[PDB]
Amino acid sequence: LRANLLVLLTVVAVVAGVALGLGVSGAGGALALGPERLSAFVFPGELLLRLLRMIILPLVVCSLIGGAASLDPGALGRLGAWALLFFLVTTLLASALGVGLALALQPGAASAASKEVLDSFLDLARNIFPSNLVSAAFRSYSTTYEERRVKVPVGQEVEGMNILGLVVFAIVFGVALRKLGPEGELLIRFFNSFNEATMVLVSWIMWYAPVGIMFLVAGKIVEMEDVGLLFARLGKYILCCLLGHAIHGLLVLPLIYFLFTRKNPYRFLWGIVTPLATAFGTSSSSATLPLMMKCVEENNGVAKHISRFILPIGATVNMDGAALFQCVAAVFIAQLSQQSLDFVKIITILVTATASSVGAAGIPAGGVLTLAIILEAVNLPVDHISLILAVDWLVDRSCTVLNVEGDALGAGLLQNYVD
Numbered sequence: 036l037r038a039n040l041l042v043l044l045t046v047v048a049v050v051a052g053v054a055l056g057l058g059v060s061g062a063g064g065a066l067a068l069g070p071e072r073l074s075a076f077v078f079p080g081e082l083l084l085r086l087l088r089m090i091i092l093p094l095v096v097c098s099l100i101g102g103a104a105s106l107d108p109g110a111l112g113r114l115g116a117w118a119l120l121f122f123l124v125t126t127l128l129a130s131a132l133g134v135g136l137a138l139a140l141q142p143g144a145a146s147a148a149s150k151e152v153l154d155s156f157l158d159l160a161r162n163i164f165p166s167n168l169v170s171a172a173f174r175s176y177s178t179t180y181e182e183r184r185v186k187v188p189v190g191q192e193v194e195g196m197n198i199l200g201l202v203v204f205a206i207v208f209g210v211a212l213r214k215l216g217p218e219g220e221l222l223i224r225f226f227n228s229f230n231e232a233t234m235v236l237v238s239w240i241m242w243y244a245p246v247g248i249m250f251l252v253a254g255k256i257v258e259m260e261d262v263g264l265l266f267a268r269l270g271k272y273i274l275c276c277l278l279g280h281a282i283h284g285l286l287v288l289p290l291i292y293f294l295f296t297r298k299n300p301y302r303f304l305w306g307i308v309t310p311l312a313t314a315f316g317t318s319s320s321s322a323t324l325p326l327m328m329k330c331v332e333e334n335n336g337v338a339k340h341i342s343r344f345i346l347p348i349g350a351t352v353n354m355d356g357a358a359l360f361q362c363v364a365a366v367f368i369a370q371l372s373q374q375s376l377d378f379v380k381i382i383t384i385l386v387t388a389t390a391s392s393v394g395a396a397g398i399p400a401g402g403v404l405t406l407a408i409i410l411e412a413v414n415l416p417v418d419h420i421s422l423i424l425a426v427d428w429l430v431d432r433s434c435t436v437l438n439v440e441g442d443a444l445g446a447g448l449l450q451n452y453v454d
């Protein structure tokens with residue numbers, strides 16, 4: 036089977052990427068290569084990110100317009116409501132698991148060591164309703180601060196695709212096409228044909244993923260040297276985050292899939308091995324979304340309309356890894372500052388992490404910007420975030436795997452709901 040060969044190549048790519056990275060790091064390291072050779076060494080991994088990011092805009096817009104126009108607005112609303120409930124519950128479970136493991140293992144035992152909450156949510160609302168569709172294709176609204184000793188929040192569009200705004204518009208535009216009737220049928224055919232043509236490009240970029248993944252993980256563990264020192268002071272915090280992702284991604288999420296759909300959940304996860312490893316390599320849910328939608332449609336039996344609707348929405352809203360990581364970091368920082376957390380402080384940590392996970396941009400290093408929001412809500416020192424940045428390169432990659440895995444299993448869950 037061609038799917039099995041792709042999975043075998045992807046598995047070898049991750050193994051070879053780790054082996055190549057340690058070998059390069061061990062033998063000469065980044066210093067021996069130098070900037071002239073380091074840029075070329077990681078370039079094949081960068082090429083995969085560029086190819087994946089180039090097709091996000093045509094895939095997200097056309098799939099959601101076609102997906103929303105292929106269902107009755109009442110049926111689409113029910114499917115969306117069920118998807119949001121699954122996203123909220125799983126994010127809550129990830130948040131609860133992260134706090135529970137952090138309280139149990141206590142990573143902050145040996146204490147050997149931004150944007151406001153309102154402005155963050157106002158930026159989310161501004162990004163949900165973009166002021167320009169063309170600008171939203173490569174820019175997002177962000178809020179900065181100016182001294183006028185009172186901080187005045189001034190806003191302007193920064194580089195970075197506004198996927199959430201494009202997701203919202205495409206769904207609304209798709210509903211408008213459905214309500215148009217016969218006159219909007221031509222546009223439904225156009226976006227479906229455009230979506231199908233883009234999927235042909237995905238199948239070609241799909242075969243380059245093992246080559247890109249190998250050089251993407253090899254370059255990361257080469258440029259991030261002194262790993263042993265990192266695993267010596269934050270080894271327990273990394274364990275809490277990675278074990279929480281493993282427990283939620285291999286025990287909790289598969290069990291939820293098994294309970295509703297009485298099918299093997301790890302057979303579903305085997306079909307999406309390539310996007311999961313791509314998510315690990317790229318550390319972005321947006322770039323691996325093209326491959327996830329490719330595997331979910333063909334490798335698994337998920338319907339075309341379900342996959343093309345739930346996955347683009349989940350790639351921006353459903354982030355189980357971000358919520359678990361933020362909850363562990365919030366408790367870890369609290370333990371470092373010797374702050375005791377009672378039931379009320381735990382509850383607001385769960386709620387704030389769930390809300391902040393929805394606002395996370397789904398981009399590399401994009402989950403630590405919302406970590407400060409949780410800290411101020413629960414009143415913990417923010418200076419300890421610098422520790423999180425040291426190991427974020429590894430934790431974020433684990434988050435991305437969990438961020439997209441819930442989206443795929445959610446598509447499988449909602450597949451049986453329609454059936």
Ligand SMILES: NC(=O)CC[C@H](N)C(=O)O
Nearest residue numbers: 319320357397402434438
């Ligand atoms: N830590 C996080 O989950 C941030 C988002 C993550 N990089 C993703 O794209 O899924």
Ligand code: NA
Nearest residue numbers: 122123125126
């Ligand atoms: Na979730």
Ligand code: NA
Nearest residue numbers: 349350353438
């Ligand atoms: Na996601």
Ligand code: NA
Nearest residue numbers: 351392393395
């Ligand atoms: Na998000």
